[PDB]
């Protein structure tokens, strides 16, 4: 009965938790992607240098 609203109150808490964890996760995803992009850029330029000279 009334504890159905206790389950509802939990849902909301869990959704706040999910939103927060999702934002942190994306922020760190974006960082790792950036690092890796730089690493790839470096490797491509290294190979380019060797072919060139």
């Amino acid at each position: 009965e009334n504890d159905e609203e206790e389950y509802e109150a939990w849902k909301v808490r869990e959704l706040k938790r999910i939103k927060r964890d999702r934002e942190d996760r994306e922020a760190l995803e974006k960082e790792k992607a950036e690092i890796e992009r730089m690493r790839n850029l470096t490797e491509e330029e290294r190979r380019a240098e060797l072919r060139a000279n």
């Binding site: 206790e6 389950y7 939990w10 808490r13 869990e14 938790r17 760190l28």
Partner: protein, 177 residues
């Protein structure tokens, strides 16, 4: 004083004596307490089982005299005797006693591997049962299990213990093979 020392067989946790995860003055206030002197005499995991089932609330210390709650006393006792992972996991998995569950959870958060922390604490997010919480003032507040679990996984301090640094799950996953 000897009965308050960390058991002979115990290994180090987070580079130190497991009891030292709790502040020096907090330990001292625990050893001095009525609850510890009467209810925590003994070095056995079964003691912890029996007393844990008698827990009515979560908390750390309260008052400007820094008095320990039973919850915190049992936590120190657990650091001191270093029970085996099986019992802690049983504490956690048990569905009948919420305070036992939370006691096992805090201990897992304090002493477990990053992996074990997520593995065993995260499913407890489903547990939304009401719990009694004694704040720093000595006031009793309503709380919910999953909120305690969230505090264990995202706070610096719970029950007046500074939580050992815990890697974010995404980093441990990116570390996975």
């Amino acid at each position: 004083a000897m009965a308050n020392r960390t058991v002979k067989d115990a290994h180090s946790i987070h580079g130190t004596n497991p009891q030292y995860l709790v502040e020096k003055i907090i330990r001292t206030r625990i050893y001095e307490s009525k609850y510890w002197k009467e209810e925590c005499f003994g070095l056995t995991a079964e003691l912890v089982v029996d007393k844990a089932m008698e827990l009515r609330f979560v908390g750390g210390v309260y008052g400007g005299n820094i008095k320990p709650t039973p919850f915190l006393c049992l936590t120190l006792k657990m650091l001191q005797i270093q029970p085996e992972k099986d019992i802690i996991v049983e504490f956690i998995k048990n569905e009948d006693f919420k305070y036992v569950r939370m006691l096992g959870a805090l201990y897992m958060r304090l002493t477990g591997t990053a992996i074990d922390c997520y593995k065993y604490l995260e499913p407890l997010y489903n547990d939304y049962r009401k719990i009694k919480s004694q704040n720093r003032n000595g006031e009793f507040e309503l709380m919910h299990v999953d909120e305690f679990i969230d505090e264990l996984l995202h706070s610096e301090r719970v029950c007046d213990i500074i939580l050992p640094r815990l890697q974010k799950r995404y980093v441990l996953e990116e570390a996975e093979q």
